[PDB]
């Protein structure tokens, strides 16, 4: 889970080469479906997604 209440089962450990890789070369650690939102109405996670990156930079 995130801190935003998104709970999910790990679906598959995903071979890293198959995990889409950034312009930078950073494959994501976790890949959460973009469809699992509007229903759960959790914006703070998008926001955190920004700030988290924003901080780390």
């Amino acid at each position: 889970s995130s801190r935003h209440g998104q709970k999910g089962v790990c679906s598959r450990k995903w071979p890293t080469i198959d995990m889409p890789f950034s312009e930078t070369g950073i494959q994501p650690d976790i890949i959460i479906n973009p469809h699992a939102f509007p229903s759960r109405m959790t914006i703070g996670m998008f926001v955190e997604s920004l700030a988290g990156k924003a901080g780390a930079l």
């Binding site: 889970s1 801190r3 935003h4 209440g5 998104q6 709970k7 999910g8 089962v9 790990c10 679906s11 598959r12 450990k13 995903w14 071979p15 890293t16 198959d18 995990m19 889409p20 950073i26 494959q27 994501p28 650690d29 976790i30 890949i31 959460i32 479906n33 973009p34 469809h35 699992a36 939102f37 759960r40 109405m41 959790t42 914006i43 703070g44 996670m45 998008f46 926001v47 955190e48 997604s49 700030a51 988290g52 901080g55 780390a56």
Partner: protein
Amino acid sequence: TADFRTLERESRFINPPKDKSAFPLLQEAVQPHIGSFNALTEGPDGGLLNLGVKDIGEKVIFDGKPLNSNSGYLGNKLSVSVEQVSIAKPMSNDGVSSAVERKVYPSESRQRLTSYRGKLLLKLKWSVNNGEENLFEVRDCGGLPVMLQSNRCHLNKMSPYELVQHKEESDEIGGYFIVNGIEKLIRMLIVQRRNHPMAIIRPSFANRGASYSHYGIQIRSVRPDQTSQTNVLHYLNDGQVTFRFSWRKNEYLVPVVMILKALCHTSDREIFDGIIGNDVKDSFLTDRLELLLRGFKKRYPHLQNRTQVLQYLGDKFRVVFQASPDQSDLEVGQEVLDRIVLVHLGKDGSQDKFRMLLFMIRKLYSLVAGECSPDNPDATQHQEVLLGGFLYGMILKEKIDEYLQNIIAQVRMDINRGMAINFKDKRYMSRVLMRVNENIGSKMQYFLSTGNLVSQSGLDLQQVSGYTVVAEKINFYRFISHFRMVHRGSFFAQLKTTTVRKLLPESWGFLCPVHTPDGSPCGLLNHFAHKCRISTQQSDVSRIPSILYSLGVAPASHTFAAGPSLCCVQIDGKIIGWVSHEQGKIIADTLRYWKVEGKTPGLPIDLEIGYVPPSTRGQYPGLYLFGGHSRMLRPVRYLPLDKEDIVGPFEQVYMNIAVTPQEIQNNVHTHVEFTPTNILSILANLTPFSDFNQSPRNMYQCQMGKQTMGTPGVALCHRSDNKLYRLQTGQTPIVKANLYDDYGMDNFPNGFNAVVAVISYTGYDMDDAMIINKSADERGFGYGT
């Protein structure tokens, strides 16, 4: 914007503080438990127990020797009463020989999987023939479990650097019980506001009999010893008013007029005048009232004296209270009142209890007259938290009480055996006690283990059990989650109605709205807004009346008047006097001002000021001041000055409190919340941007956070706890709330920061959805144990 304080961080881990914890809030969180438990032995008055035992008093039995004077001589009078109670800190004697003992640190109790218990000691006065001969002998009722980090816990006062030396979590907050190595704690409950009349409407009342209405005035009176006694006034449809009380798990009913004459010598005219006051222009009350007086007369024409009344009462209940054969029904009658009616006013409140009892009847008819609205018991307005320590004392007082009963029983059987008996004999005394079974600690330890309350009276507690709950160390959050936890009790869990689990607006800033479990416990388990504090001790009211009487309060002693027509002034359920509403509002405000100002001595800020403005069919008006224990006090900011003020829930309802300074309106708000974050749980505050999430979704987080695989603690090597989870590598969340550092969750990283793409790619993460980079994992990511 907060920071990592990484240097400041590590310097702490490296060198823990040799003076005091760096996370004071974290302590102040658990304060309700320790504040309660320490208060058992503390306070200028000698501690709750020493006050509690003082209530039990003597246990009298008679040998029955004739003396050879038909003769009214009952033999020697044995007087059995305890004197003062002490609790030794946990100590280890080495086998026998009374070799010089060593202190016991809980780390040992954990690893040995035993209870962590201090010894329990009783100074017992064995008296014969009314102090003609008396015997002081100290006893040991067995090792008593002790709350960690309390005044009887050796760990107390240790600087964090020392706890590490004694192998406890550097920040260890204690506040709980080690029982058989299991960590238990008494989860706080919610009980009716003490020392405060409650105009109740319940259908269950009408069910109790034919002429019972559903109306009632319930009050929950609690002695300074924290024993709670309920007294309820049912309004009967015929116009009778039956005082109801409870004793030995049994309900009993009394005509209220009987009791008024029982309390104080008084004239019927005075009672009537004592209620109606200036309201004689009303027919309704008089009509209701005369049927109550003419009711008591000609129901009981053989009672022309308060004494006769007292005698009559004793006549009935002497059986009930097991009164000693010497005690006259006059004498017993006096006890019945003293041990039941409005206990919080003490044995000397006889003249006060009379007034208070009139006040209810006044209010009751008003409720029946519908002039005042009923009072929601579910409403946090009328509620108070019942601390663990106080409960743990209550039970203990019961066991002590029953213990004396056990002694007298041993003697009577020893008497009815006809065996030769000398009360003055010291060896005989020992002969009795050695035969007597005294281990209280085990019984208490039994309690904490089972959480099953076993008592002669239910302690005015609806449910019988569920009082203890295991401390769960899964993550750190779930652990601390317990100490901010509270609920109404399991009896309300089974109720079909869900109104009890409603998010009443009265919980603002007290019960965190966000943090509750889901499913069946939802709406029951609640958590205090992290700034919510509980009053663990009394506050001095000594000079309050002096202040009040100075402020224009007409003494309740004289100046008969009553009714919602004009304000009433009370302290912890004691009528000080009466004022016009307009005056009271000026008073309560002024008083509120001085309270914060602080320059006026004898007026502590924690005192609630309960001013109830008069209204149309609203709550019964008045001015209420609750300084006692177990109040929900929370901080606010006071606008006329700028200073911290403290606010109870009861008084919150009427106070206009702006959330943020920008919302302050002219002549509207007298107060403002410091930060709006003050209304949230620990975890609630921790959820980032929780205002952006959907509320039911945040509400999971609080429940998810408590289920995480976290860092339970650093003591793992020395902790023997059964089943334990630990996340191998935690990370400080970049996105953070300032409280995260204040509460110092740094010491317990609950998770990691993950590079996350919100995308539909693999297709394997459709429903639940969770794709983990494989290589990322194998790098140790999220590795648990």
